[PDB]
Amino acid sequence: MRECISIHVGQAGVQIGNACWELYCLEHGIQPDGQFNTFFSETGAGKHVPRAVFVDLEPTVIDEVRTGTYRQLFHPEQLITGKEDAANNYARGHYTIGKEIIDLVLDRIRKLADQCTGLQGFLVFHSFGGGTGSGFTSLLMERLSVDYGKKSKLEFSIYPAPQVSTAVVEPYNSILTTHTTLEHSDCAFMVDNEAIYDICRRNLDIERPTYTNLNRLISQIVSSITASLRFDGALNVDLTEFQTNLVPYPRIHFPLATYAPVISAEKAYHEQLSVAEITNACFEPANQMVKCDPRHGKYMACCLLYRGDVVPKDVNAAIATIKTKRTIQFVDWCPTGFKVGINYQPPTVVPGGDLAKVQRAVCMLSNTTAIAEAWARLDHKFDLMYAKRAFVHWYVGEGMEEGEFSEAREDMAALEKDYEEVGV
Amino acid sequence: MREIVHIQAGQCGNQIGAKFWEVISDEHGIDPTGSYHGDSDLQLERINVYYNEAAGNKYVPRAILVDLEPGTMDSVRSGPFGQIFRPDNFVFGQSGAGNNWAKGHYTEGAELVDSVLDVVRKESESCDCLQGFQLTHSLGGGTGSGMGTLLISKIREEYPDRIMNTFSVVPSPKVSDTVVEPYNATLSVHQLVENTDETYCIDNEALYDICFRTLKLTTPTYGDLNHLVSATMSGVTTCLRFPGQLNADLRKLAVNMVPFPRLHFFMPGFAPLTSRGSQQYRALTVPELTQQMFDAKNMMAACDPRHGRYLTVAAVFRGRMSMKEVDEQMLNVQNKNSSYFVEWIPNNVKTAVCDIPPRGLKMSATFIGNSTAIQELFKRISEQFTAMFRRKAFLHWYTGEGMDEMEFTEAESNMNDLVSEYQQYQ
Amino acid sequence: MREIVHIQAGQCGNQIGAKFWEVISDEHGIDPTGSYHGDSDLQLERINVYYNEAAGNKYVPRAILVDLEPGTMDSVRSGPFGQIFRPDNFVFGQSGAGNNWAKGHYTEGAELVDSVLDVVRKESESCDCLQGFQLTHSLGGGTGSGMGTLLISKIREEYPDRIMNTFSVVPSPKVSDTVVEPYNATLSVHQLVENTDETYCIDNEALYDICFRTLKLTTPTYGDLNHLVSATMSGVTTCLRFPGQLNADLRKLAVNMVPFPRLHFFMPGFAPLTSRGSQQYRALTVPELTQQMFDAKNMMAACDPRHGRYLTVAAVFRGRMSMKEVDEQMLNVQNKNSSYFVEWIPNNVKTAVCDIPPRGLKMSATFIGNSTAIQELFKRISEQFTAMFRRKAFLHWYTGEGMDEMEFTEAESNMNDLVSEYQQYQ
Ligand SMILES: CC[C@H](/C=C(/C)[C@@H]1C[C@@H](OC)C[C@H](O)C(C)(C)[C@@]2(O)O[C@@H](C[C@@H](OC)[C@H](O)C(=O)O1)C[C@@H](OC)[C@H]2O)CO
Ligand SMILES: CC[C@H](/C=C(/C)[C@@H]1C[C@@H](OC)C[C@H](O)C(C)(C)[C@@]2(O)O[C@@H](C[C@@H](OC)[C@H](O)C(=O)O1)C[C@@H](OC)[C@H]2O)CO
Ligand SMILES: Nc1nc2c(ncn2[C@@H]2O[C@H](COP(=O)(O)OP(=O)(O)OP(=O)(O)O)[C@@H](O)[C@H]2O)c(=O)[nH]1
Ligand SMILES: Nc1nc2c(ncn2[C@@H]2O[C@H](COP(=O)(O)OP(=O)(O)O)[C@@H](O)[C@H]2O)c(=O)[nH]1
Ligand SMILES: Nc1nc2c(ncn2[C@@H]2O[C@H](COP(=O)(O)OP(=O)(O)O)[C@@H](O)[C@H]2O)c(=O)[nH]1
Ligand SMILES: [Mg+2]
């Protein structure tokens, strides 16, 4: 049967993973003590065990998981630990400390694969900017590529925001990650914290958020992406289809991920929440989950994942309407720029949560030239930093070389050029 | 994993250290007899970062107490938490240091240092994964300055891939506490420039300002000043000892705060600091805390931060708070006042958050600033030193211990180079 | 039919033996007083393989307990199952062996061996059809090594057409337990090469690895290690004592596992071995069990099996399982990783299955591997021995008992020949 393996790497990734697992449990009625095959590997005592890899170089987040509510759910191995974190240092992830743990991780992955009779591939959770999530993740991905080749390697990545950050070596790390996951990862789905905060401010009418809320939101999106593997419905999408439909050229593979309706209990009753409306919301500039205007960019390819009550006719109508709008610009070379997925199973509400129950929800994954601007900004930042050789002694002092940075910059430039070409 | 070894040297170093050990003890629910009386499992989970466990659920700080004279350490032992320390971890000489760096570094201290190193080695061998060393001392005396520097040199030579961080009490522009202070400070600073990964610069005048202007305290004791310093110290390592949303680390902070290897002198701050009279009058919001943090009046160095630019600042928040709010506040500060932040490093502010707040507070924060304004301190020290050295005033006390003029000139050169470097980014 | 006589010699041999007799007793439903309290007729059907019946439904193990010093056997008697043994089957001397093979083999042991042989003869006379002998000892000491070897020599001379199999605890590459270990081991191994039909090679370091890495056991006791060994031992003879789909036998295993007469040194393994924390997390499938079995981390010798090739492996499965599945798994291992199996012996894996699983498990398995990697152990021993012998270090203790240099050289020669033979098939 259809089976996939999750990998959660870092602090952020692990946090996201916790939320995801909670959501999954809520969906499939599994208790916190383990009392589906797609995600939960079943054993001979009416016990369901997640099929995930949990990795951190700092033993803190993992320790929390091990002590908390869902400790009996997880295996005592899936949760892997180290001794000291990378500390926002790609070099300490990719070269120095990662090559101590990576083997174990690989072994675990192999074991998990062995336990499956049709592994669709991988879902990986990391962060552009973090020390572990940048370098270690990259290393892992390379190894996976070497091993499996034609198994799906999907990534969920926390992109650094333009006007806000939490680390002053974040441009370097991200750039390095981009350089060394450009020839491995098939899809890298993007979420941005600033964007999420903006969404919270606007749609939810909440202006005192925290990381937990963000994680929950991310988990919803993840669930939507993966809902076709675990339930019936017209147009059952696969993990392998995304690659086919959202990657026109192999270097160009960063699509944005957005969710609608993200709305509180008060204006759920006021709104109709029809299909068309939701679709419209999905394409609105402010509702997007990154800091980019899709008015400044042409949509190459979009993928829509309707979940709940949806008459396909209505969906079609909505799509037609979207096409009609002047705006919402598409590229010349992609007329058919839509993929549609439908599930009978509705979204699931998490107790003590932000979101209310809905009849129908939609998740949109869109690959566009709007991200080019973001990339350019990042490059500029990098240039500003690297011109004075700031922080370079840390990276060079653990493995890296002067020249690698230059190469990375060149690669970024090439990517930008490609994007520009696509735009024409 | 992540054990930290503490070294406290000389009078000030031992005194501050005593207070620090008190504070940490109370945070971990450890009583003076080494017994745990906490209410949360979080209290013990990472207790190994600062403490070693012994028979009968006894916890013993990984602390090494060093002095060339016995008085101060005798007082420490007599003190409240004094009985918590391992007796074998008191290492002392018999002759004083006479506020003389040469005696601390080359002669009296040289005779004692091997014994200290042996104890250090013993402690490091008990670490599953030693993170590094924390030192507490003054820069203006003989023991903390000369002996302390010497110890640092030795340990870095033996453990060059570990973190070496110091809390260093420096002389104050108005009211010096010894006559040879400039000489001692310059001699220490020379060594620290090359042998430490980070140094927190504490100025007693700034502490007095905090006590009088901010805390409204008519009669501050050294004890009270020490408390403040201890609070700042605890802040730095909070993310090793407790859970959080953004788990910081010493190394992480170093990575984000040191853009060039020699520029590792930080101005520490702490918040909130509010008078006992005006407690109910303040609303304890993250914005207000941020404002306190960035206020020059709430800094602990002898600088006007507005007379320079911030290369990087690290903020560590403690308690429950909205990450959204924190980030927004950080953005607002930088956008509004971009002139006070070096333009070649976008996102000059790094934030960390630890869920467990210190006793008696719902929220707190610790501020660590790498500002080009620090050059003023160095420049002033250099001026003072030169004023003396050009007349070879007081120099016979040092030449008599085997030091040469050339060393002093080297020290001066280093200082000036450092100042020049700082001026570059100013 | 198919009676097995057990001999346990020296300290380690007696200790392991005690545990083995406990385990077998529990398997057969025999309590420490020799009373049967089982629930199945299968428990008694072949009880005669290990036990002798006495008046009042008493069962007495066919075990001979041998030592040159009384301490260990006094402890055994004091122990839980100690009262089950026949008092007349304790054969002991008065003077110790001083970790000295010569004392065990030529002098002290020579004085005692006739008495042991008499007991052995007496036991063999009570066998309707004696299959053979099982010996438990260490290779590094004096009694188990020297005396034990001597006994083996005697019995093979008298019963040359019976099976002679040993569980032999060998020295470990990191942490030797005696200084003369290389000498003793080499002297024993020389004799075992020519006088035993099969030897199971147990390494205490491997056991510790199993306990720490696999079982997650913070504080393993020798008792716990012994338990594991006993489990492996029981596995080997399971098919004599219970029904099955493929009824194995000692002789059958020998036939399939020894392609050349001198290559009879096996690496044993056992499965499943899982931490008490992570029990519900594992699905107990035959495939997973197979994977455990073939994992180097689950072996009990001081070898990296990946540094050699398997000449033959025998797997004995216990519990209910699909023969289809078992065969398929075996095929998959060989096809996938044909490089780790000697190419001149098609179907390198032999499988046996016994229906009745051990207590507390639905399925289990025991692994027996004849790998060319074993040469590493021998090579390392030889290196050590030569390092000493070339300086005649410690040699006077042996020459004083009448041994000559020539014997040592002969032993070395044998060892080297064995290594060369192993290298042939590598
Ligand atoms: C066939 C004889 C045999 C030779 C090999 C290579 C065999 C084959 C496979 O097992 C049957 C390996 C196996 O499929 C796994 C990958 C699941 C795995 O178990 O491999 C080991 C490492 C591997 O050696 C590399 C192992 O030690 C071993 O012995 O492997 C790590 C482990 O971490 C959980 C896990 O990742 C020696 O007897
Ligand atoms: C037939 C007449 C007879 C002659 C012989 C040799 C007889 C035959 C057998 O007994 C019937 C021996 C017997 O089968 C045993 C081996 C079990 C055993 O009993 O032998 C003796 C030693 C043996 O002499 C060597 C004995 O003293 C003896 O008299 O043996 C040790 C004893 O230790 C427990 C045990 O090992 C004299 O009357
Ligand atoms: N959405 C979300 N973002 C997070 C979370 N935790 C961290 N981040 C973001 O991730 C980035 C920091 O990377 P981390 O994952 O914390 O770093 P790490 O992978 O643990 O690497 P090191 O700590 O450097 O070893 C920042 O942009 C954070 O805002 C989380 O729980 N949710
Ligand atoms: N903050 C603080 N400063 C101190 C303390 N004790 C001494 N000092 C300061 O330390 C400097 C004197 O050095 P001291 O440590 O006493 O000399 P040493 O024993 O030779 O190292 C002066 O600047 C004093 O103001 C203390 O307990 N707290
Ligand atoms: N596994 C195991 N090894 C043992 C035990 N007792 C001793 N040893 C090992 O046996 C060797 C020492 O030989 P020992 O049997 O005590 O000497 P002997 O009485 O002269 O044969 C060493 O390698 C010990 O580690 C035991 O109970 N179990
Ligand atoms: Mg981390």
Q: In A, which residues are within 8 Å of B312 by CB distance?
A: 168
Q: In C, which residues are within 8 Å of A117 by CB distance?
A: none
Q: Tell me: is residue B347 an annotated ligand-binding position.
A: no
B108 to each of B94, B184, B400, B411, how far by Cα in Å? Answer: 9, 15, 13, 21
Longest dimension (CA), chain C: 62
Give the span between the Cα atoms of C188 and C198, in whole angstroms: 14
CB contact under 8 A, A77 and C281: yes
**φ, ψ for residue A391, nearest 5 deg:** 65, 0
Residues of A with CB under 8 A from a CB of B: 11, 15, 58-61, 63-64, 67, 83-85, 87-89, 131, 163-171, 193-194, 197, 200, 207-211, 214, 381, 384-385, 387-388, 390-391, 393-394
Distance C122 CA to ligand 2 centre (A): 9
Does a cis peptide bond (omega within 30 degrees of 0) precede residue A261? yes
Q: What is the CATH number of domain A371-424?
A: 1.10.287.600
Supply the residue whose CA is at minimum distance from atom 6 of ligand 1: C306
Q: Which residues contact A224 (CB under 8 A, 6 or more apart)?
A: A259, A305, A307, A347, A361, A362, A363
Q: For chain A, where do the domains classified as CATH 3.40.50.1440 start and end? A: 1-255
Can you spell out the DSSP letters for C301-332? Answer: SS--GGGS-EEEEEEEEEES--HHHHHHHHHH
**Ligand 2: nearest atom to the Cα of C117:** 36
Q: Quick one: CA torsion of B222, B223, B229, B235, rounded to 10 degrees? A: -170
User: What's the token pair of residue B158?
Assistant: 């033996």
Sign of CA dihedral B67, B72, B74, B75: negative
The pairing of beta strand B163-170 with beta strand B198-203: parallel
Start-to-end C-alpha separation, chain A? 43
Is residue A241 annotated as a catalytic residue, yes or no? yes
- H or E segment to which residue C23 belongs: helix C10-27
Q: Tell me: is residue C410 an annotated ligand-binding position.
A: no
Q: Which residues contact C318 (CB under 8 A, 6 or more apart)?
A: C235, C238, C353, C354, C356, C357, C358, C361, C363, C364, C365, C366
Supply the residue whose CA is at minimum distance from atom 22 of ligand 4: B177
Cβ of A221 below 6 Å from ligand 3:
no
CB contact under 8 A, A43 and C278: no
Structural contact between residues B6 and B64, judged by C-beta atoms closer than 8 angstroms? yes
Q: Tell me: is residue B72 an annotated ligand-binding position.
A: no
**φ, ψ for residue A365, nearest 5 deg:** -115, 115
Q: Which residue ranges have their beta carbon within 6 Å of ligand 2?
A: C 118-119, 121-122, 125
C337 to each of B81, C33, C310, C340, how far by Cα in Å? Answer: 64, 50, 11, 6
CB contact under 8 A, C282 and A47: no
- H or E segment to which residue B351 belongs: strand B349-354
Tell whether domain C374-426 is in CATH 1.10.287.600. Answer: yes
Q: In C, which residues are within 8 Å of A40 by CB distance?
A: none
Q: Tell me: is residue B204 an annotated ligand-binding position.
A: yes
Q: For chain A, where do the domains classified as CATH 3.30.1330.20 start and end? A: 256-370
Residue with token string 């960390």: B352
CB contact under 8 A, A168 and B254: no
CB contact under 8 A, A83 and B252: no
Cβ of C141 below 6 Å from ligand 5:
yes
Q: Which residues contact C280 (CB under 8 A, 6 or more apart)?
A: A34, A43, A45, A47, A49
User: What's the token pair of residue C58?
Assistant: 């008493």
Q: Tell me: is residue C372 an annotated ligand-binding position.
A: no
Distance B43 CA to ligand 5 centre (A): 44
Structural contact between residues B118 and B64, judged by C-beta atoms closer than 8 angstroms? no
Residues of A with CB under 8 A from a CB of C: 34, 41-45, 47, 49, 75-77, 114-115
List all chains that touch chain C, counting a touch as 3 or more CB pairs closer than 8 Å.
Answer: A
Strand-by-strand arrangement of the B349-354 sheet? B90-92, B63-67, B3-9, B130-138, B163-170, B198-203, B265-271, B363-371, B310-319, B349-354, B244-246
Give the span between the Cα atoms of B57 and B39, in whole angstroms: 16
- Residues in chain A, overall count: 424
Q: Which residues pair with B369 in a beta bridge?
A: B267, B313
Give the span between the Cα atoms of B284 and B269, in whole angstroms: 17
Closest to B323 measured CA to CA, from A130, A350, A166 = A166
Distance A86 CA to ligand 6 centre (A): 7
Cβ of A209 below 6 Å from ligand 3:
no
Return the number of other C-beta atoms located less than 10 Å from residue A174's C-beta: 23
A39 three-state secondary structure: coil
**φ, ψ for residue C55, nearest 5 deg:** -65, 135
Q: What are the percentages of helix, strand and coil residues in chain C, rounded to 5?
A: 50, 20, 30
Judged by its nearest atom, the ligand closest to the C-alpha of residue C144 is 5
Return the number of other C-beta atoms located less than 10 Å from residue A281's C-beta: 21
CB contact under 8 A, B2 and A210: no
Q: Which residues contact B56 (CB under 8 A, 6 or more apart)?
A: none
- Report how many Cβ contacts below 8 Å link chain A to chain C: 26
Structural contact between residues A340 and A304, judged by C-beta atoms closer than 8 angstroms? yes
Q: Which residues contact B69 (CB under 8 A, 6 or more apart)?
A: B92, B93, B94, B95, B96, B97, B143
- Residues in chain C, overall count: 426
State how far residue A18 is from chain C, nearest Cα, in angstroms: 18
Q: Which technique?
A: cryo-EM
Closest to B333 measured CA to CA, from A130, A165, A195, A159 = A165
A269 to each of A274, A357, C122, how far by Cα in Å? Answer: 12, 11, 95
CB contact under 8 A, A49 and C216: no
- Pick the catalytic residue from A142, A194, A241, A404: A241
Which fold would CATH assign to domain A256-370? 60s Ribosomal Protein L30; Chain: A; (3.30.1330)
**Out of B245, B256, B259, closest to residue A167 by CB:** B256
**A1-255 CATH, one of 3.40.50.1440, 3.90.1300.10, 3.40.50.2300, 3.40.190.10:** 3.40.50.1440
Burial of B75: CB neighbours in 10 Å, binned 0-12, 13-18, 19+? middle
Start-to-end C-alpha separation, chain C? 39
**Out of B255, B324, B331, closest to residue A89 by CB:** B255
Q: In C, which residues are within 8 Å of A47 by CB distance?
A: 280
Domain B1-259: homologous superfamily in CATH: Tubulin/FtsZ, GTPase domain (3.40.50.1440)
**Ligand 5: nearest atom to the Cα of C171:** 23
A48 three-state secondary structure: strand
Q: Which residues contact A370 (CB under 8 A, 6 or more apart)?
A: A256, A292, A293, A294, A296, A297
**Residue whose CB lies within 8 A of the most ligand 1 atoms, among A106, A110, A114, for a mutation test:** A110
Q: In A, which residues are within 8 Å of B345 by CB distance?
A: 168, 384-385, 390
List all chains that touch chain B, counting a touch as 3 or more CB pairs closer than 8 Å.
Answer: A
Q: In C, which residues are within 8 Å of A41 by CB distance?
A: 283
CB contact under 8 A, C283 and A43: yes
Can you spell out the DSSP letters for B236-280? Answer: HHHHHHS-EEE---HHHHHHHH-SSTT--EEEEEEE----SSSST
Residue with token string 């402690």: B123
Q: Where are the domains of chain B?
A: 1-259, 260-373, 374-426
Residue with token string 């930093």: A385
**C260-373 CATH, one of 3.30.9.10, 3.30.1330.20, 3.40.50.300, 1.10.10.60:** 3.30.1330.20
SS3 of C77-93: the string is HHCCCHHHCCHHHEEEC
**Ligand 1: nearest atom to the Cα of C297:** 27
Q: Tell me: is residue C144 an annotated ligand-binding position.
A: yes
User: What's the token pair of residue A55?
Assistant: 């990795």
Q: Which residues contact A352 (CB under 8 A, 6 or more apart)?
A: none
Amino acid at B220: P
- H or E segment to which residue B334 belongs: helix B323-336
User: What's the token pair of residue A37?
Assistant: 């095959």
Structural contact between residues C398 and C186, judged by C-beta atoms closer than 8 angstroms? no
Return the number of other C-beta atoms located less than 10 Å from residue A413's C-beta: 13
